[PDB]
Tab-separated table of C-alpha atoms and ligand atoms in Angstrom:
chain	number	residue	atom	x	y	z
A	4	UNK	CA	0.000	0.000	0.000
A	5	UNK	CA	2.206	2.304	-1.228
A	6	UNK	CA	-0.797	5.089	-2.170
A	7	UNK	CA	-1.776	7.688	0.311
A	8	UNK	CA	-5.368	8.794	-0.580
A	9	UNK	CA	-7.608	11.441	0.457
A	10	UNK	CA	-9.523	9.371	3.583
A	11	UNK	CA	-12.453	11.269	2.758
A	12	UNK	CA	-13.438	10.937	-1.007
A	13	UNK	CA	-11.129	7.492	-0.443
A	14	UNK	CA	-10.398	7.403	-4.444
A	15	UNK	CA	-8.191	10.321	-4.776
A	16	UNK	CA	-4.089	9.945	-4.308
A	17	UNK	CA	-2.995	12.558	-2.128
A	18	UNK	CA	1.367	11.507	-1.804
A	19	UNK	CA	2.981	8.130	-1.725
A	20	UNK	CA	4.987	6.357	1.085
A	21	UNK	CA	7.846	6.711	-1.571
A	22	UNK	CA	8.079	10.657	-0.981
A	23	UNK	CA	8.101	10.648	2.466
A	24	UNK	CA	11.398	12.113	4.379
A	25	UNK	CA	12.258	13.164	8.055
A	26	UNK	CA	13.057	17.456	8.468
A	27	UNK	CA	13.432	16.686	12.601
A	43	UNK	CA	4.351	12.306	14.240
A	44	UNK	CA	0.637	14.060	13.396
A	45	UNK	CA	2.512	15.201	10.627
A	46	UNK	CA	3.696	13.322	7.476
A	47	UNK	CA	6.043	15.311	5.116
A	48	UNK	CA	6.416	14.430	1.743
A	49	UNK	CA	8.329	15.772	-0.874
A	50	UNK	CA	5.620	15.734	-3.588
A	51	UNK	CA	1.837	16.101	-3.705
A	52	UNK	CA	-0.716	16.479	-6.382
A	53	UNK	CA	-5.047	16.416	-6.168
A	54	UNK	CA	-4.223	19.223	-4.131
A	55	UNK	CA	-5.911	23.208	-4.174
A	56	UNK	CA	-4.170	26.195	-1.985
A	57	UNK	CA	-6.468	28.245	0.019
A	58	UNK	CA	-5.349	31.924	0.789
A	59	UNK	CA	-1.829	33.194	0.929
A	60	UNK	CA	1.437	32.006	3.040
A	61	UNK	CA	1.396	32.430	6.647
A	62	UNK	CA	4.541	31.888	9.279
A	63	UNK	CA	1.834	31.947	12.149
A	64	UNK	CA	2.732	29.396	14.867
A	65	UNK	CA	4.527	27.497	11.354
A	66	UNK	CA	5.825	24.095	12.509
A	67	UNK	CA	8.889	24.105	11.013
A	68	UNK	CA	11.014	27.290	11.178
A	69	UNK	CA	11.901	29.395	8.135
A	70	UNK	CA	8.961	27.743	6.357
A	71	UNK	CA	5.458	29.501	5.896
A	72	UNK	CA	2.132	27.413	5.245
A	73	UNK	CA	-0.499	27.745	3.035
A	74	UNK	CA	-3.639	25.738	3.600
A	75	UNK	CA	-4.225	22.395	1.479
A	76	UNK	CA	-7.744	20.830	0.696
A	77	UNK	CA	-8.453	17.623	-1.199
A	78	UNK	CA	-9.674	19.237	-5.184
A	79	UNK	CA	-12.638	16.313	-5.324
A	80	UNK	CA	-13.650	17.077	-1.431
A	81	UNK	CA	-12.224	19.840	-0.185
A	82	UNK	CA	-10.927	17.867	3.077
A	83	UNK	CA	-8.343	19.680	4.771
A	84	UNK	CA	-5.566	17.363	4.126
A	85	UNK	CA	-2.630	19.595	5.607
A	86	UNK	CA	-0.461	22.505	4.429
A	87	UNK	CA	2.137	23.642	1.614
A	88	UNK	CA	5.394	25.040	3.206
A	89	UNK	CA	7.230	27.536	1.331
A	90	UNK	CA	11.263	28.748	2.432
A	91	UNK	CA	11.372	31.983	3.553
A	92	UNK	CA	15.452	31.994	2.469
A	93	UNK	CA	16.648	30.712	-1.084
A	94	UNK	CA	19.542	28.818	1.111
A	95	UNK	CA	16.958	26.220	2.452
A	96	UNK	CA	16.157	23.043	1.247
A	97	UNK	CA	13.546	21.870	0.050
A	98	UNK	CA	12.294	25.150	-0.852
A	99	UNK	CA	8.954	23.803	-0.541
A	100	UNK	CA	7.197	20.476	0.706
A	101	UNK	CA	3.870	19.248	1.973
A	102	UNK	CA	3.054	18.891	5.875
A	103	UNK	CA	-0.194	16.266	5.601
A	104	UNK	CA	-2.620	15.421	9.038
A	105	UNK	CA	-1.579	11.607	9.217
A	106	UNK	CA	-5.547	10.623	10.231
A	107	UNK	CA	-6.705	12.464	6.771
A	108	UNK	CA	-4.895	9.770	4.542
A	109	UNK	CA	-5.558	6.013	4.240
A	110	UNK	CA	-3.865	4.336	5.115
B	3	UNK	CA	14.440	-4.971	-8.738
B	4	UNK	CA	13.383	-3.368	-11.853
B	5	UNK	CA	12.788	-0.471	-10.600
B	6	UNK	CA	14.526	1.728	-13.574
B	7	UNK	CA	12.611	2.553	-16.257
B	8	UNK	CA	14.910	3.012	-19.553
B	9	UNK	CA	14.735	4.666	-23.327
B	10	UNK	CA	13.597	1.304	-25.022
B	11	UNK	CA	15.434	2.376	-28.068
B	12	UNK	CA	18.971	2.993	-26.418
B	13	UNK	CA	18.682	0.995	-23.637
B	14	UNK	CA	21.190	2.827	-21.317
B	15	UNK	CA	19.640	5.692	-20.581
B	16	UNK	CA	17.912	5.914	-17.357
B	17	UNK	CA	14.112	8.103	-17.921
B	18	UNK	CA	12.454	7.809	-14.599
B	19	UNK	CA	11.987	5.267	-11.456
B	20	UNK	CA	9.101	3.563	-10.479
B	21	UNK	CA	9.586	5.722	-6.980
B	22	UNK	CA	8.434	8.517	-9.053
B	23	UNK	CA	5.028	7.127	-10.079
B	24	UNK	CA	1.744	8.556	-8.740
B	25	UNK	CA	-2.082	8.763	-10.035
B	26	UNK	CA	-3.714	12.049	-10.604
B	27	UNK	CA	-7.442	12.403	-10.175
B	43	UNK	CA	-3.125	4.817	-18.720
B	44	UNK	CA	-1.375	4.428	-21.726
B	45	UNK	CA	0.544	7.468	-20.238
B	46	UNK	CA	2.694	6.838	-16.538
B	47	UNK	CA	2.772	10.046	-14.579
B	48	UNK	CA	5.577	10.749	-12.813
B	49	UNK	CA	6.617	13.478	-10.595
B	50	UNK	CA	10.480	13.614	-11.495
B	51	UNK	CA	12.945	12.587	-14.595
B	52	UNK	CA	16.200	12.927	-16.353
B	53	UNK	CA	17.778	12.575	-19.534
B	54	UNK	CA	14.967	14.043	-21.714
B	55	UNK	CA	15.431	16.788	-24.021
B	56	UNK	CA	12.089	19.690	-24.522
B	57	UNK	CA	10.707	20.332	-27.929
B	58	UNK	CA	9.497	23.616	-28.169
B	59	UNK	CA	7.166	26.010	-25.830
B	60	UNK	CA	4.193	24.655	-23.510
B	61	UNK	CA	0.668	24.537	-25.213
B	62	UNK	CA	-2.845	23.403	-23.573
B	63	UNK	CA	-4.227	22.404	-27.315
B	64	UNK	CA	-6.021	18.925	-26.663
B	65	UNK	CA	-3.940	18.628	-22.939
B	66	UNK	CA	-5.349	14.822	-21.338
B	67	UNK	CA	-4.281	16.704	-17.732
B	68	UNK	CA	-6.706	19.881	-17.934
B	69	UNK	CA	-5.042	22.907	-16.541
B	70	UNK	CA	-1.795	21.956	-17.819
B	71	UNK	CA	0.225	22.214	-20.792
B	72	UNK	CA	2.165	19.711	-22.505
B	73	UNK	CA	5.650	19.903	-23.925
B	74	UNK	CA	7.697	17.366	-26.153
B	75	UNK	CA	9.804	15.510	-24.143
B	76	UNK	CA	12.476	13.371	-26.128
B	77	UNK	CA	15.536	11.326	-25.387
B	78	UNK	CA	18.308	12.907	-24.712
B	79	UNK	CA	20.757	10.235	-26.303
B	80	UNK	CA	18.675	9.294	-29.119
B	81	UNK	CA	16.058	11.503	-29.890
B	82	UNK	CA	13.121	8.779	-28.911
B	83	UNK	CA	9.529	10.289	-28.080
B	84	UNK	CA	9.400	9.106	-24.467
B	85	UNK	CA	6.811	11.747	-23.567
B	86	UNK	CA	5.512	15.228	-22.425
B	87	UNK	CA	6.353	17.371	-19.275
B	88	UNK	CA	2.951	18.622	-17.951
B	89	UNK	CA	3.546	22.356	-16.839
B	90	UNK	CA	0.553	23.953	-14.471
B	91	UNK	CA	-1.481	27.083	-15.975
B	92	UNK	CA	-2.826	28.015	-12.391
B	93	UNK	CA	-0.703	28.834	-9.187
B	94	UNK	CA	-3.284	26.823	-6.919
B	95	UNK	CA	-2.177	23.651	-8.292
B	96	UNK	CA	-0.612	20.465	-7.430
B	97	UNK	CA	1.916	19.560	-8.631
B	98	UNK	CA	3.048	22.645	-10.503
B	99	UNK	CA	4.511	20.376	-13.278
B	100	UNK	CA	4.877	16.318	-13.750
B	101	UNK	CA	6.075	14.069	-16.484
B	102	UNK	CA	3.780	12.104	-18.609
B	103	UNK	CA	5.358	9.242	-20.514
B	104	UNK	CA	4.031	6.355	-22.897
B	105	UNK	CA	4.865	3.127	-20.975
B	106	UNK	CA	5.756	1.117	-24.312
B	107	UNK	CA	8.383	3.796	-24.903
B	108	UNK	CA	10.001	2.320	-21.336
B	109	UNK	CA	11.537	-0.498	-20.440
B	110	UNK	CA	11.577	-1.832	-16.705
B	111	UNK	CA	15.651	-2.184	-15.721
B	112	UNK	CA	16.956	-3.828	-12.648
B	113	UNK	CA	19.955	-1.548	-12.412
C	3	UNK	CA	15.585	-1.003	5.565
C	4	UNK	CA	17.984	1.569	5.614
C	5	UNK	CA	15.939	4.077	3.729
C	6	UNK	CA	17.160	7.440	5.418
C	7	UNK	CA	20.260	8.542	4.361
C	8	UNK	CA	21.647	10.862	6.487
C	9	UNK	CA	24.852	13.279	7.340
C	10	UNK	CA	27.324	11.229	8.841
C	11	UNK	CA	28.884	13.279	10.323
C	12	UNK	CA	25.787	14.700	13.066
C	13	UNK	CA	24.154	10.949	12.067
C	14	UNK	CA	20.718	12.164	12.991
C	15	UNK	CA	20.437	14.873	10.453
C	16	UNK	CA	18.656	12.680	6.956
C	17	UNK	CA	19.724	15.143	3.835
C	18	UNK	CA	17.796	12.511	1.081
C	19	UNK	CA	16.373	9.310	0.614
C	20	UNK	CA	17.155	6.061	-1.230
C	21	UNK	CA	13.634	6.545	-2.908
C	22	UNK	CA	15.281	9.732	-4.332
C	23	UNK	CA	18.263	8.402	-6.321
C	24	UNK	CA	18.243	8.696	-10.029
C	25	UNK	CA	21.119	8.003	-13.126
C	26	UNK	CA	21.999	10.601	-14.487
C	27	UNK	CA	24.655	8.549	-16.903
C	42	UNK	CA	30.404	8.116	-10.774
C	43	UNK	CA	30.897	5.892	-7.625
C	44	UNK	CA	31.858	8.855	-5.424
C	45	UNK	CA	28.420	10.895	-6.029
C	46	UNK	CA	25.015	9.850	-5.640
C	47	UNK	CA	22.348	12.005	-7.542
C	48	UNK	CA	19.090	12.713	-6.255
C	49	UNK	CA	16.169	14.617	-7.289
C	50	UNK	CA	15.146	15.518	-3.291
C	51	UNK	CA	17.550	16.606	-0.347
C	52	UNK	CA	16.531	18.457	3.104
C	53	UNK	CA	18.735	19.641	5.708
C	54	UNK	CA	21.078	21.460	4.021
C	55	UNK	CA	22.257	25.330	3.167
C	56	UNK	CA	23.622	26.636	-0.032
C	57	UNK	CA	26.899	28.423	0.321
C	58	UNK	CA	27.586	31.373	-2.404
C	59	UNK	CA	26.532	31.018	-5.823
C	60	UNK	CA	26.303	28.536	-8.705
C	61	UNK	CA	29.511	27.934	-10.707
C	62	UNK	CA	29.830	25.870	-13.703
C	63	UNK	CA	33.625	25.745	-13.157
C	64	UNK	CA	34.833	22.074	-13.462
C	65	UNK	CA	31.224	20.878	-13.105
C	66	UNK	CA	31.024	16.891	-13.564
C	67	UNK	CA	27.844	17.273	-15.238
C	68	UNK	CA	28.293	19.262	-18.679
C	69	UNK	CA	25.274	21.732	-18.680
C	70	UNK	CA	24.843	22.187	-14.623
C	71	UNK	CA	26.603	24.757	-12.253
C	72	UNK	CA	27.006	23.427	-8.952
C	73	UNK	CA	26.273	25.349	-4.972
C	74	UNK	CA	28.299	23.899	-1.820
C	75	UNK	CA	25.408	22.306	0.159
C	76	UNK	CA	26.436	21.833	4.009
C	77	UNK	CA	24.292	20.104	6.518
C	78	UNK	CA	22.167	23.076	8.285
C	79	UNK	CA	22.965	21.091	11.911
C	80	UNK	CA	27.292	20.934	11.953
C	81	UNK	CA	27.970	22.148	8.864
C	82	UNK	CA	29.616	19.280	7.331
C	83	UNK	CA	29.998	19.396	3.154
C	84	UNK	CA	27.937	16.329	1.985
C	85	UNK	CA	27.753	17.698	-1.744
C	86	UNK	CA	26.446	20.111	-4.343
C	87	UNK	CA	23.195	21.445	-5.894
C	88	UNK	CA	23.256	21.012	-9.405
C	89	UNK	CA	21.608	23.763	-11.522
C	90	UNK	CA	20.587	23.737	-15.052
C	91	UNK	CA	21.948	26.339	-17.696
C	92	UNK	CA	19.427	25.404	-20.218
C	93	UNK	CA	15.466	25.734	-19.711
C	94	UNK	CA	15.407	22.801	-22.406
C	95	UNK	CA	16.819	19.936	-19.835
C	96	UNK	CA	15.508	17.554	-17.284
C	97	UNK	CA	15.487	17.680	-14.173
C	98	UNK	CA	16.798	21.593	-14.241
C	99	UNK	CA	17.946	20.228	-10.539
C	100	UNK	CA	19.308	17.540	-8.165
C	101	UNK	CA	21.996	17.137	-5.527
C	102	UNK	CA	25.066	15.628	-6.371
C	103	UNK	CA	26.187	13.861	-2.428
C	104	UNK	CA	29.246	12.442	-2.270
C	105	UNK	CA	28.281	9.042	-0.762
C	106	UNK	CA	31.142	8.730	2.011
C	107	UNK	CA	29.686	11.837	3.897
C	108	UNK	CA	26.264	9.657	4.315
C	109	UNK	CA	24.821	6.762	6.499
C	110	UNK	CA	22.198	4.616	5.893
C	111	UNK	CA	19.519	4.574	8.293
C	112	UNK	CA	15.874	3.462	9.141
D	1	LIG	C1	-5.827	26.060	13.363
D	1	LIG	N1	-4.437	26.321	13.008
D	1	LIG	C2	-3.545	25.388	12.511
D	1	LIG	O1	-3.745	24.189	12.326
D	1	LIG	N2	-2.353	26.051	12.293
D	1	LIG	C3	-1.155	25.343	11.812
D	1	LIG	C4	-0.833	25.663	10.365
D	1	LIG	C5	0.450	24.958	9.944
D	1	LIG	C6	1.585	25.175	10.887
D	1	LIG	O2	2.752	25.146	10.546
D	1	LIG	N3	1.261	25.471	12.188
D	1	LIG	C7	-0.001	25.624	12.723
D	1	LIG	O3	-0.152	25.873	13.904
D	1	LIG	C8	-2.503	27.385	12.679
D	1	LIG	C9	-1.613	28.453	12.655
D	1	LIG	C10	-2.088	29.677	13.108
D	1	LIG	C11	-3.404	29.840	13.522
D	1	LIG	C12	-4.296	28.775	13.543
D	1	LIG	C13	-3.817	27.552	13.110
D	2	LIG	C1	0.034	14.352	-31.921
D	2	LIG	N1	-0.440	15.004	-30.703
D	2	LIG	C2	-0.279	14.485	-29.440
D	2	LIG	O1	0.286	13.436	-29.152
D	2	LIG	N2	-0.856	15.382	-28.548
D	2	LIG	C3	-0.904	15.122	-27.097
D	2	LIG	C4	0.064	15.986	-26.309
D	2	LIG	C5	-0.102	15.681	-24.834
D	2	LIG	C6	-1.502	15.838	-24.353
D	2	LIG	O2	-1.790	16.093	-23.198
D	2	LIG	N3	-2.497	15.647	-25.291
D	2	LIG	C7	-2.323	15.301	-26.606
D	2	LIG	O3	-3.290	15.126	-27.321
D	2	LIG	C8	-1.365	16.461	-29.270
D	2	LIG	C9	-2.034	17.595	-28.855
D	2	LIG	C10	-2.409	18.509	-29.832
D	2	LIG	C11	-2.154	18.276	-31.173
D	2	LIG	C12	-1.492	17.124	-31.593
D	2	LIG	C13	-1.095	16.235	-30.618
D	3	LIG	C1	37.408	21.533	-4.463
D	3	LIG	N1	36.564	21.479	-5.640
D	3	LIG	C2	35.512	20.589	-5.797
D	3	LIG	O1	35.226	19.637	-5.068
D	3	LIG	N2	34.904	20.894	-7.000
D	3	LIG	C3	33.762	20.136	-7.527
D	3	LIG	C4	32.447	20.879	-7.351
D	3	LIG	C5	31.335	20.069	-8.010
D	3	LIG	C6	31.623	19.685	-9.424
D	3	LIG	O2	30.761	19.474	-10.255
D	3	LIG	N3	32.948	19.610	-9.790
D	3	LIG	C7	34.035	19.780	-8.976
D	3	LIG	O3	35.159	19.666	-9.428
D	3	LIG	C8	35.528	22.007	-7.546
D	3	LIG	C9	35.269	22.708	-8.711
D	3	LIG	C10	36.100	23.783	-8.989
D	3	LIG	C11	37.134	24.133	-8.141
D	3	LIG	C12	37.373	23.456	-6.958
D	3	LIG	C13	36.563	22.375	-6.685
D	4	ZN	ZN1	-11.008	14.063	-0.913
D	5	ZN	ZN1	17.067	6.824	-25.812
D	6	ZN	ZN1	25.437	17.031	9.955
């Protein structure tokens, strides 16, 4: 079960266990993402993971709130962008 | 393991893993990352399979081979912002 | 399975992923397509790059500073992937 989908809608891919990686457990964060829309703008309020801002991620079929984009806030960071995802929103 | 995925034609030269496969929500593996391909010309939407992206040429780099398209998105809100779709018979599954 | 691959050097610190390793076309470097934990000292050069048609950037691990490679940067809008990290593989550890 390498496919983690949207535990809503159930039928839409959200990542896979093959772009997960560790930046330091609620919080899975992948390197890529896609069935994905961005609500609003960036934020750095209470951000997780210092330097990074978020930006609110919903399921496109559902509009579950699967987790957040973070974006650098320095061009000397990597990645310059990767997806924080709420563990319980994906199935597995 | 074959978990490279080669230019049929030359053999050698590594396209993409099988790492870098996801589904988006057949004929045509989508793949978030890949090398050794060479772009043919400027992004266009005209008959796109992926709608909100555009499609570019995407050819071997060694032998000139029609492997695929990168996918490139026309919207900011978007996810991924570009991907690689590639016609699986133009692959071949490599243990290396 | 040793998945994580990370600075050897501060051994907790992962900077990339065996799920991230690609072939670009040699034993001393390991390319991949995804890397964390590191900062880019000064700019790109192109001066003695090993891969014709990428400048590389000194990437250090962001915890003790330790030089595990290079981002490679593409000169040419036409070629895939337009980055990677280039690691050299001695300055790594395999991990969970
Ligand atoms: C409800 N809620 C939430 O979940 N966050 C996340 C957003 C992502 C992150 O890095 N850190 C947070 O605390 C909030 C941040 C500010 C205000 C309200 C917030
Ligand atoms: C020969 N040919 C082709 O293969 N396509 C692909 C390009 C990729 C995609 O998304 N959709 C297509 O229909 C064409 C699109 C327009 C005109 C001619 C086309
Ligand atoms: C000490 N040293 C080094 O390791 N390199 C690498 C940088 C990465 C690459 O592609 N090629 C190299 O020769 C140098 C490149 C120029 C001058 C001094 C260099
Ligand atoms: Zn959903
Ligand atoms: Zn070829
Ligand atoms: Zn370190």
């Amino acid at each position: 079960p390498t496919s983690l989908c949207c535990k809503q809608c159930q039928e839409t891919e959200i990542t896979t266990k093959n772009e997960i990686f560790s930046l330091s457990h609620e919080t899975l964060t992948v390197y890529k993402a896609c069935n994905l829309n961005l609500i609003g703008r960036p934020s750095t309020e209470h951000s997780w993971f210092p330097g990074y801002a978020w930006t609110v991620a919903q399921c496109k079929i559902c509009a579950s709130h699967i987790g957040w984009k973070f974006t650098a806030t320095k061009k000397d960071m990597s990645p310059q962008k990767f997806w924080g995802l709420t563990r319980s929103a994906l199935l597995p």
